[PDB]
Design a protein around this ligand. Structure first.
Ligand SMILES: [Mg+2]
Ligand SMILES: [Mg+2]
Ligand SMILES: [Mg+2]
Ligand SMILES: [Mg+2]
Ligand SMILES: [Mg+2]
Ligand SMILES: [Mg+2]
Ligand SMILES: [Mg+2]
Ligand SMILES: [Mg+2]
Ligand SMILES: [Mg+2]
Ligand SMILES: [Mg+2]
Ligand SMILES: [Mg+2]
Ligand SMILES: [Mg+2]
Ligand SMILES: [Mg+2]
Ligand SMILES: [Mg+2]
Ligand SMILES: [Mg+2]
Ligand SMILES: [Mg+2]
Ligand SMILES: [Mg+2]
Ligand SMILES: [Mg+2]
Ligand SMILES: [Mg+2]
Ligand SMILES: [Mg+2]
Ligand SMILES: [Mg+2]
Ligand SMILES: [Mg+2]
Ligand SMILES: [Mg+2]
Ligand SMILES: [Mg+2]
Ligand SMILES: [Mg+2]
Ligand SMILES: [Mg+2]
Ligand SMILES: [Mg+2]
Ligand SMILES: [Mg+2]
Ligand SMILES: [Mg+2]
Ligand SMILES: [Mg+2]
Ligand SMILES: [Mg+2]
Ligand SMILES: [Mg+2]
Ligand SMILES: [Mg+2]
Lengths: 127, 58, 172, 51, 159, 222, 185
RNA sequence: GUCAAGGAUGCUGGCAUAAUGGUUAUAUGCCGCCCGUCUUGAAACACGGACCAAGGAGUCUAACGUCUAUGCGAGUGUUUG
RNA sequence: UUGAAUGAAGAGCUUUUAGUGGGCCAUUUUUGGUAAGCAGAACUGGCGAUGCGGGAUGAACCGAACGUAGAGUUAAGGUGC
RNA sequence: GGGUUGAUAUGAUGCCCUGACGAGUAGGCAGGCGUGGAGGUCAGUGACGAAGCCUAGACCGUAAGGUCGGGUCGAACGGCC
């Protein structure tokens, strides 16, 4: 359990994909503003894709929070993990992608001992 | 190549973007253009007035 | 203009030092409301006298109700209108129970038959024809016959449903 | 934080305007006028009904 | 060819005002102009020396300099997006006093007199000008003035 | 502390005195509105009895609502609308009727609907849409204290004194009316009437002088 | 839609903090922000504003300028406050005894002030010995005496110092600068 | 003391997982012309573009202008040596 | 009530520099022409640079100018399908 | 536009209160995302698997992008100033 937070409203859950990224393979989905002079997306015609603008900004009380209600703090070892000793209801640890299987064991054990939430307690688990 | 020669379209709009400014009148205007015979006298009348005021004040 | 309203409008032409107590010109105006009534008063006094709104005043405006609103009356209406290609005078006759209903019938009649808008039309006179045989038009002299009755053939009944189960009859 | 409306919310209509209680008690907005008996002049009536 | 001379498009405007041609009457020369006097510019076309430009006719300015036969007038001229001060050496045949300023100084004298009278009393004076207020309530009598007018007229032609 | 309890008791006593002042002022205002209305009615009756006609006093106050939007306005009526503080559609202001404002209204006639507000619609406008201008910052009125803090030097202590200075165009009408932020009205709740808005009210549209019919429209927009 | 009579989202055009990363100047701005907020003396607002100023807006105030300011009637025992640098002046041969509260003093200025029995003060010692700015005299150096201000507003008949690299004969003293060659300006 | 007075609390039920929700494919309703570019005007019956990966275009220098930061301040610049 | 009304969004000032220097349309006034989706001027408002609702469709017309949403109400236009 | 220092409270390029506003080409300015290499630092990650690459699996950010899980892989590579 985390701190009590307001209900998280995201205001645009859909990814802002680039124009014609569905149409050409050279055009990746990473968002680029269309700066063309005759561009319908830039001119905002009805029926075209929405562009990212600041009105879609998340509520500051519920910003950066995961659905559990925690901000994710990236953790590489036990010394990174114990920064969240007094912040267990606010921050959840998340073990980095390059940590060993044998070091994830001691990170997870110490986080269980401290009450710190881990958002990926299943990476590199021998089953 | 034939084209537009002259128009005063948009000129009043551009003129009023930063306003039409009145020339900011001052006390003690410049004596540029005022009569030189008046100016030469007025220098001495001012000098004597300031001399007499300093004598009466000290 | 749901029904018209007749107003007396009395105006003065503002008193000056040389002439105090001016002459108080008065009209009968058919209008929707007092705003249009005062506007039409000034429109017609600018046609009759040297006065406008700036150099005059409205001293009074009173609605004139019908004296007998449930007595069926024959009205002679003298009217001047602007056609597309001139100005003409007409005299029409309207059978109705009140002057404002007669003038509404006149305005619908003129807009229908002569395509004349409200702006084109001046109501010069509405006067009740006090006795029959001074009534001049056949379309109103029809109804002034003794013991008049007429039927209404081909009654069309308005249905509230989109489907009927009876093949309806137009008797009446 | 929130604009409560007088013309609803009699608590705010009494926070503003302490006379609202006296107005509602004496009814003061449904008060009868004195029945005077003024009759208009014949010149006014015949100008009004004049053709 | 375009013509843009000093007295171009001044045909009717330096013209000499029918049955008032000829000599300039002496009160024009007998008026006294001091520095700070506000003056209207209207060019006398009979006097050709010291004429203003055709821009400056109708314009009103403040006298800054007084010479033998002329005065110097400051006219603000709208040039582009600002005004510029224009100093004009105009002979006194093209210059007369501004009656707006004359009645303004009579208003100043009247205001001073009314404030002195209200200080002789103890009452306020309220000495600003006010606009044309809406008219107050009237009772228009009908004695001798019975409201009597008929309707619009028919269309007769009288050609 | 005990001194703080003394200041609290002093503040509540001052608040009761201010409320007694406001209550007696509102009672006096109601009495003079009632007597002025009865006096005009009896003046009309008395003139009709004497055979004369009582010409009512010309209206000292208009309420002006901008009914036309932002684009395609000529510069002179645009400047007059900005000087009457009608900078968006369905903004209303009270305007003192003199000759120096009647020729403003004649200039902005195709873009506003104006008329003569009654006491009821003035009261409902200031009660519901009434906002102040305090450090320019558009403060909602909601309390007689913020009207006393800004218009109290002109003798206005409450929202009813503020209404009184509008309906009777007082000596400090300009200061009271400029304290009032322009009323952000809604669209009318039963429509405008009038299939097309931008003809005159005489011609079957909405704009122009709408003399005593502005109360119906403004109460629909309020 | 709003018919805007002004520019929307327009910044005030004034510095609200110094552009410097000087931690001691940020500390002085912190102190005079407190003293501008909590004292309601106008001196602290003026000094807080002047702490934001740039190097061309903080010209050096000479000790001769300070002494001329103390030569005013009844200003001889005031505290001269210079939000900026106080520089020396060897042209003045008699410096009085006074208290000067400045950001920086040059070594010659500090020596000249303390040689005459004076006292050189930082703006926080001024804040503890005159928190409402009592008995103070703010002095400012000359801004239009900068060399860059000579060339500002250059045009015909302005007399405003052409942007030039080498100065002499053959360097802009010819057609356009005398009646004989062409015209005069 | 209470209150409807400077912003929702009380009571109850079901579920406690794919049930709500997310992603995703599809279907339906309505909308949606191909981008870049020159142009007064581009979907143009204007031009470039078959597709993809990598490469690919305001850089550095000499001398300066405004502004800003810093050091010292009638001085200042150690670095030719 | 210090010399009319209304407004004032802070007022005044300085430095520096980008782009631009092909325009076009509409009401009204206009010149050349028989006239033009022609060529040229005046004032304004637009399009360019601008989406939205309407005119089926359209750069300019009408209404209205646009952060992300909810509810209400309308504008211009409409209400047989 | 303001409030907030004698534990503000140790985030005062902070926290908070209040009101208004938000279109945009060319253009200007600001705040940020990413890349190769350098100084410092985390006594950072790593053959118990670094980087890469694949992934209609998950999370965060309006977005630039960041993070994680699985597969493949085999020697190095990140966070912050
Ligand atoms: Mg997302
Ligand atoms: Mg996205
Ligand atoms: Mg991309
Ligand atoms: Mg385009
Ligand atoms: Mg609010
Ligand atoms: Mg000519
Ligand atoms: Mg003439
Ligand atoms: Mg409805
Ligand atoms: Mg589950
Ligand atoms: Mg679902
Ligand atoms: Mg379609
Ligand atoms: Mg272009
Ligand atoms: Mg194109
Ligand atoms: Mg090709
Ligand atoms: Mg190719
Ligand atoms: Mg590449
Ligand atoms: Mg060029
Ligand atoms: Mg050209
Ligand atoms: Mg012609
Ligand atoms: Mg466009
Ligand atoms: Mg459209
Ligand atoms: Mg339409
Ligand atoms: Mg069509
Ligand atoms: Mg259609
Ligand atoms: Mg129109
Ligand atoms: Mg809606
Ligand atoms: Mg923008
Ligand atoms: Mg690197
Ligand atoms: Mg290791
Ligand atoms: Mg790996
Ligand atoms: Mg794929
Ligand atoms: Mg190997
Ligand atoms: Mg990297």
């Amino acid at each position: 359990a985390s701190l009590p937070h307001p209900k998280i409203v995201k205001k645009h859950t859909k990814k802002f994909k680039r124009h014609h990224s569905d149409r050409y393979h050279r055009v990746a989905e990473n968002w680029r503003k269309q700066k063309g002079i005759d561009s319908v997306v830039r001119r905002r015609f009805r029926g075209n894709i929405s562009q990212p603008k600041i009105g879609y900004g998340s509520n500051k009380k519920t910003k950066f929070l995961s659905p559990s209600g925690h901000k994710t703090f990236l953790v590489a070892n036990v010394k990174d993990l114990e920064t969240l000793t007094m912040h267990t209801k606010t921050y959840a640890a998340e073990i980095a992608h390059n940590i060993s299987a044998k070091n994830r064991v001691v990170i997870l054990a110490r986080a269980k001992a401290l009450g710190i939430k881990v958002t990926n307690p299943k990476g590199r688990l021998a089953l | 190549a034939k084209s537009k020669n002259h128009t005063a379209h948009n000129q009043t709009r551009k003129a009023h973007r930063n306003g039409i400014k009145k020339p900011k009148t001052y006390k003690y205007p410049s004596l540029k253009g005022v009569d030189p015979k008046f100016r030469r006298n007025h220098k001495h009348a001012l000098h004597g007035t300031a001399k007499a005021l300093a004598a009466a004040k000290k | 203009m749901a029904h018209f309203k007749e107003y007396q409008v009395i105006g003065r032409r503002l008193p000056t030092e040389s002439v105090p107590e001016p002459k108080l010109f008065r009209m009968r105006i058919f209008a929707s409301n007092e705003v249009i009534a005062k506007s039409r008063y000034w429109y017609f006094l600018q046609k009759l006298h040297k006065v406008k709104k700036a150099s005059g005043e409205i001293v009074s405006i009173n609605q004139i109700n019908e004296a007998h609103p449930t007595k069926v009356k024959n009205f002679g209406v003298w009217v001047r209108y602007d056609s597309r290609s001139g100005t003409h005078n007409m005299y029409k006759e309207i059978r109705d129970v009140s002057r404002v209903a007669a003038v509404e019938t006149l305005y619908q009649d003129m807009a229908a038959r002569h395509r004349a808008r409200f702006r084109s039309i001046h109501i010069l006179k509405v006067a009740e024809i006090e006795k029959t045989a001074d009534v001049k038009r056949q379309y109103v002299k029809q109804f002034l016959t003794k013991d008049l009755k007429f039927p209404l053939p081909h009654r069309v009944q308005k249905s509230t449903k989109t489907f009927s189960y009876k093949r309806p009859s137009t008797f009446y | 934080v929130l604009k409560k409306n007088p013309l609803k919310n009699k608590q705010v209509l009494l926070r503003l305007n302490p006379y609202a209680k006296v107005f509602a008690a004496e009814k003061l907005g449904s008060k009868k006028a004195e029945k005077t008996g003024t009759k208009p002049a014949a010149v006014f009536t015949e100008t009004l009904k004049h053709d | 060819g375009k013509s843009h001379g000093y007295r171009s498009r001044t045909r009717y405007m330096f013209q000499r005002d029918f049955r008032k041609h000829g000599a300039v009457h002496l009160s024009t020369y007998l008026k006294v102009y001091k520095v700070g006097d506000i003056v209207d510019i209207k060019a006398n076309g009979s006097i050709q020396k010291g004429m203003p430009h055709k821009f400056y006719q109708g314009k009103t300015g403040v006298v800054y300099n007084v010479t033998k036969s002329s005065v110097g007038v400051i006219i603000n001229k709208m040039v582009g997006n600002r005004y510029l001060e224009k100093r004009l050496n105009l002979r006194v045949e093209h210059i007369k006093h501004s009656k707006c300023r004359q009645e303004f100084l009579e208003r100043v004298k009247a205001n001073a007199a009314k404030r002195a009278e209200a200080k002789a009393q103890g009452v306020a004076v309220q000495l600003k000008r006010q606009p044309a207020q809406p008219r107050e309530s009237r009772i228009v009598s009908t004695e001798g003035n019975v409201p009597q007018t008929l309707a619009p007229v028919p269309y007769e032609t009288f050609i | 502390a005990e001194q703080v309890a003394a200041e609290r008791a002093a503040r509540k006593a001052a608040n009761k005195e201010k409320r007694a002042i406001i209550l007696e002022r509102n009672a006096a205002y109601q009495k003079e509105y009632e007597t002025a209305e009865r006096n005009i009615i009896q003046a009309k009756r008395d003139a009709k009895a004497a055979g004369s006609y009582y010409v009512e006093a010309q209206h000292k106050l208009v309420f002006v609502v901008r009914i036309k939007g932002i684009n395609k306005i000529p510069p002179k009526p645009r400047k007059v609308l900005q000087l009457l503080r009608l900078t968006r559609i369905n903004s209303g202001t009270f305007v003192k009727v003199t000759k120096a404002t009647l020729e403003l209204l004649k200039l902005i006639e195709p873009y506003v609907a104006y008329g003569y507000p009654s006491y009821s619609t003035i009261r409902q406008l200031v009660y519901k849409r009434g906002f102040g201008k305090i450090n320019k910052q558009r403060v909602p009125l909601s309390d007689n204290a913020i009207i006393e803090a800004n218009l109290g030097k002109y003798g206005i202590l409450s929202i009813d004194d503020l209404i009184h200075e509008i309906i009777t165009v007082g000596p400090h009408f300009k200061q009271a009316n400029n304290f009032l932020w322009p009323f952000k009205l809604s669209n009318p709740s039963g429509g405008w009437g009038v299939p097309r808005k931008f003809k005159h009210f005489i011609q079957g549209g909405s704009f122009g002088n709408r003399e005593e019919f502005i109360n119906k429209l403004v109460k629909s927009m309020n | 839609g709003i018919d805007h009579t002004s520019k929307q989202h327009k910044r005030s055009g004034h510095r609200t903090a110094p552009k410097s990363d000087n931690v001691y100047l940020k500390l002085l701005v912190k102190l005079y922000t407190f003293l501008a907020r909590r004292t309601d003396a106008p001196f602290n607002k003026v000094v807080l504003k002047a702490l934001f100023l740039s190097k061309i807006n903080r010209p050096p105030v000479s000790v001769s300028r300070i002494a001329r300011a103390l030569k005013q009637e009844g200003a001889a025992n005031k505290t001269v406050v210079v939000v900026g640098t106080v520089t020396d002046d060897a042209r003045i041969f008699e410096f009085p005894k006074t208290t000067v509260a400045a950001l920086r003093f040059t070594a010659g200025a500090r020596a000249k002030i303390v040689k005459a029995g004076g006292e050189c003060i930082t703006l926080d010692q001024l804040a503890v010995r005159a928190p409402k700015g009592q008995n103070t005299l703010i002095l400012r150096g000359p801004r239009n005496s900068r060399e860059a201000v000579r060339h500002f507003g250059m045009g015909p008949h302005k007399g405003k110092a052409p942007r030039i690299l080498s100065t002499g004969r053959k360097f802009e003293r010819a057609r356009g600068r005398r009646r004989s060659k062409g015209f005069k300006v």
